[PDB]
Ligand code: BCL
Ligand code: BCL
Ligand code: BCL
Ligand code: BCL
Ligand SMILES: CC[C@H]1c2cc3[nH]c4c(c3C)C(=O)[C@H](C(=O)OC)c4c3nc(cc4[nH]c(cc(n2)[C@@H]1C)c(C(C)=O)c4C)[C@@H](C)[C@@H]3CCC(=O)OC/C=C(\C)CCC[C@H](C)CCC[C@H](C)CCCC(C)C
Ligand SMILES: CC[C@H]1c2cc3[nH]c4c(c3C)C(=O)[C@H](C(=O)OC)c4c3nc(cc4[nH]c(cc(n2)[C@@H]1C)c(C(C)=O)c4C)[C@@H](C)[C@@H]3CCC(=O)OC/C=C(\C)CCC[C@H](C)CCC[C@H](C)CCCC(C)C
Ligand SMILES: COC(C)(C)C/C=C/C(C)=C/C=C/C(C)=C/C=C/C(C)=C\C=C\C=C(C)\C=C\C=C(/C)CC/C=C(\C)CCC=C(C)C
């Protein structure tokens with residue numbers, strides 16, 4: 001009968017749908033590999049999908065996934081066991097080397113452009129018309145670390161023009177230089193900006209940006225990566 | 241404690257954004273409205289501009305006509321007495337015509353005629369609004385995803401007060417216009433077909449209704465968790481993968497040994513949700529037309 | 543067994559218990575102390591259900607079912623064949639659920655990300671504990687809990703519901719349903735929006751978030767924004783489940799009569815309480 005037909009059709013359909021949805025989700029990261037980075041023997045039931053091509057706007061070129069996967073950077077790690085499945089330890093300074101909770105990806109070294117081809121993120125001083133409309137203004141406040149030590153001062157808010165959102169805080173360090181801090185990794189308080197992920201002596205360690213009026217995708221990744229890893233790696237100095 | 245990013249710590253404002261132009265006819269956009277600082281704590285603060293245009297106006301008017309038609313009737317019932325109106329607000333109701341009139345427009349006002357008018361207005365309001373979402377996409381050169389997904393929700397709506405009613409032989413089968421009133425119809429519909437829990441599509445529907453709450457809960461939380469690497473910037477993380485997309489993937493890979501990509505999860509998302517009304521539409525369409533008692537059908541399947 | 547970009551993330555550390563004893567993977571699965579903890583509770587729990595299966599006389603998923611103690615046993619224990627199994631199994635389930643959450647917390651510390659995920663989950667675990675633990679304990683009997691059976695459990699919903707008439711009148715049930723419906727509307731849109739931008743009309747260039755905001759402004763006049771919609775999604779969901787647990791914790795405890803009756807307070811309000819006409823008098 002109908003209902004009984006309608007229902008089997010559905011199950012058959014739903015299986016192809018899953019199939020499709022599964023392979024679509026294999027455009028990045030595949031094929032799999034062994035810990036040494038050679039192609040892994042078993043790749044699973046689902047095959048790789050055929051390539052698709054994105055037309056990045058603003059003359060930025062194209063992108064085709066799936067495609068050749070490469071870290072395009074060195075990985076300071078060494079095996080801790082003679083078999084698969086175990087942690088790989090940092091052969092140097094995880095923070096400095098960018099491994100583990102402080103990893104970063106080698107993204108394009110350009111900034112993200114908005115709909116019109118303009119830089120998406122700009123320091124507020126260069127953002128005509130932009131101003132703090134609500135909440136406490138961080139510009140001017142001192143910056144404390146997980147060790148309750150002052151490390152610098154906020155001298156500006158870098159903002160997202162199209163989304164109109166505060167994204168980074170520019171912080172001036174002892175040697176008059178600045179660094180960028182993720183808006184998401186800081187606690188703006190009445191008379192101070194508290195940063196838990198890092199101890200005062202780690203701020204100078206934050207990666208720096210070539211130009212002082214823009215951040216490139218690659219730079220944001222190293223900056224955020226570094227700050228996030230402080231959660232695990234700063235821990236010795238972090239108190240309270 | 242660490243910051244969570246549910247609400248913003250600082251709001252930053254700039255000149256009102258008029259928005260991309262593409263082929264959009266700028267003549268039909270309105271002026272930018274104010275700025276809610278309230279909304280600003282959660283999401284954007286800018287209001288407007290809104291694009292009106294021909295079809296937009298058709299809908300809006302058509303739509304108020306539906307809402308007004310119903311409300312007039314309610315005032316009938318309320319005896320024009322305001323206090324009554326307010327008191328029995330959840331109780332009033334505009335039921336469709338009686339079984340007698342079947343599929344005819346013959347029935348008098350006070351007997352489904354008025355229901356008929358309202359429905360007609362609502363029918364225009366929706367379909368025009370559907371075309372509007374298709375068109376607004378074309379102007380900006382984007383895919384028609386929103387239009388199709390919306391069709392899914394329309395499918396159920398269509399089956400409920402139009403298709404089934406016809407196939408059954410009367411507008412009598414349709415849903416009345418009332419708060420408590422339409423709840424009953426639902427409870428009743430179930431009882432008369434042998435308790436819907438036995439309807440396989442109803443149960444499938446529910447699987448997706450829950451999965452939507454499951455997946456969006458998962459997805460939202462995921463993104464917020466990796467927003468310290470600027471993950472909410474999904475489109476760019478598609479064209480150029482960053483740690484936000486890698487940690488996000490690895491979290492679930494290590495948790496259920498299975499995972500998705502920054503673009504793929506939205507395919508999961510759009511299908512999970514869309515399947516709720518898709519399956520429900522079928523379930524309801526087969527009730528009273530092909531299957532008369534789901535308990536019985538469940539017994540044989542034939 | 544490894545994704546092209548995964549090795550750099552598999553560093554030691556982040557575990558909550560037992561140092562690096564269980565700090566390792568099995569294929570793609572992270573383990574840890576809680577990985578083991580859940581395997582245990584689950585393995586054991588499945589066994590108990592299988593056992594409960596022989597006592598019933600069936601090995602059919604469509605019929606197997608583990609019923610709780612009868613209202614006679616109140617809140618005390620019961621014999622295995624008469625509600626005891628369900629009790630032990632429930633502990634194992636709760637045990638598996640807390641472990642999975644806590645295991646995610648570890649996966650979180652290793653990747654240096656937020657704890658939003660395990661936190662949202664804790665909301666589901668709470669809904670479950672409302673039905674099998676808090677509500678029953680407040681009604682003095684494991685017997686009010688639901689049974690672990692595919693259809694037998696749908697029976698429990700149907701009865702429990704109809705015990706108060708059309709459950710549709712539970713006010714918290716209404717709010718709850720609202721959030722659920724909204725959530726799906728929201729998920730539909732969010733998914734369709736990102737896709738229509740990442741996948742524009744043939745040949746055209748990939749749209750941008752600007753186009754996304756533009757689109758909705760044009761359409762409905764407002765745009766929550768890329769970060770907002772994700773805050774919205776998390777919030778709609780968790781809210782939906784919160785109100786679900788609430789509509790149930792109050793049902794059978796502070797209100798045991800017909801839910802439809804509850805609405806009389808509104809209608810009985812003095813001002814209009816006796817006015818003639820309308821649907822009420
Ligand atoms: C919330 C109110 C009621 C309730 C009301 C309903 C109603 C009404 C319906 C269901 C339906 C289902 N319910 Mg229920 N259900 C409840 C509580 C539970 C609990 C629990 C641990 O408390 C569980 C595991 C389930 C599980 C299930 C599924 C078997 C089935 C839905 C598929 C789905 O998409 O789910 C959402 C989850 C996902 C999409 C993720 C994937 C999860 C999979 C499907 C889980 C399978 C579990 C398996 C059957 C049990 C395995 C145990 C073994 C020991 C491993 N329910 C409570 C008590 N449930 C539907 C059905 O078809 O029933 C016959 C249905 O119509
Ligand atoms: C006592 C009654 C029965 C019962 C009877 C029914 C009946 C009858 C139906 C459902 C349906 C559904 N039921 Mg049930 N159901 C029961 C118990 C349950 C339980 C439970 C835990 O006990 C659950 C989880 C569900 C779950 C569900 C959903 C999966 C499904 C509806 C999806 C939806 O999004 O619709 C909402 C979505 C729409 C209505 C889409 C259309 C919307 C249109 C396009 C928009 C109009 C907008 C308006 C004009 C606004 C203009 C704008 C202004 C600003 C306002 N039911 C009991 C046992 N259920 C429906 C279904 O699909 O079933 C197969 C259905 O018909
Ligand atoms: C799917 C199965 C049943 C069904 C079962 C149920 C059940 C069960 C419940 C509802 C509830 C609702 N249903 Mg219904 N409902 C059906 C079909 C419809 C049709 C149309 C089909 O085409 C519509 C528009 C509605 C609309 C509504 C809403 C009025 C209300 C849910 C809020 C929500 O989540 O909105 C999603 C939509 C938006 C967020 C946008 C639009 C805004 C809406 C229109 C606002 C309604 C406000 C309300 C009238 C105001 C109360 C405030 C007063 C101060 C007291 N139903 C079908 C036939 N419906 C709930 C309720 O509370 O009922 C009393 C409820 O528990
Ligand atoms: C005839 C019956 C009554 C009725 C009686 C009830 C009753 C009784 C209850 C509900 C509940 C609910 N009802 Mg009802 N309901 C009716 C009609 C409706 C209609 C409609 C359109 O008519 C709708 C939309 C709803 C909607 C809803 C939901 C809001 C809510 C269930 C979701 C929930 O709690 O999830 C919460 C999620 C969970 C409980 C799941 C927990 C999952 C756990 C943590 C993990 C499990 C993992 C699993 C074992 C793993 C498997 C692993 C394998 C590897 C796969 N009802 C009718 C009128 N409804 C329930 C509620 O509010 O519950 C609190 C409830 O008890
Ligand atoms: C997977 C299916 C899910 C889904 C999807 C979905 N809904 C959608 C879409 C999609 C993909 C849209 O694109 C469309 C949309 O536009 O979204 C923003 C929409 C939409 N889903 C809506 C509702 C809706 N969806 C629901 C459900 C669902 N939608 C499912 C969960 C429900 C439920 C649960 O019942 C409802 C009520 C609409 C809000 C919207 C389509 C709007 C529409 O058709 O409008 C016609 C216009 C009117 C009726 C205008 C008058 C309205 C009121 C009667 C009067 C008060 C308001 C008026 C604006 C006041 C004017 C005052 C004047 C002074 C100016
Ligand atoms: C609270 C908000 C929403 C939500 C969120 C949510 N769910 C989550 C998460 C989140 C954030 C996860 O991280 C976690 C996950 O990893 O998902 C992929 C999960 C998850 N949500 C799941 C299910 C689920 N979520 C549901 C709902 C929801 N989840 C809400 C809508 C439902 C419904 C609607 O019923 C179900 C079935 C799981 C698939 C998964 C968690 C997996 C887990 O904890 O695994 C380890 C445990 C086992 C293998 C346990 C077996 C334990 C017992 C000993 C045996 C069986 C006993 C049980 C009582 C039998 C029931 C039989 C039924 C027939 C009644
Ligand atoms: C202060 O008071 C004022 C004046 C402002 C107005 C007050 C109004 C009020 C208070 C209105 C309240 C209305 C409410 C609460 C309405 C609720 C409706 C609900 C809950 C559900 C609706 C279900 C309806 C669906 C299933 C309807 C589907 C209809 C169709 C698919 C179309 C039907 C099509 C027909 C009859 C054909 C038309 C004719 C042709 C030739 C195609």
Ligand SMILES: [Fe+3]
Pocket residue numbers: 459463474732736772
């Ligand atoms: Fe998203």
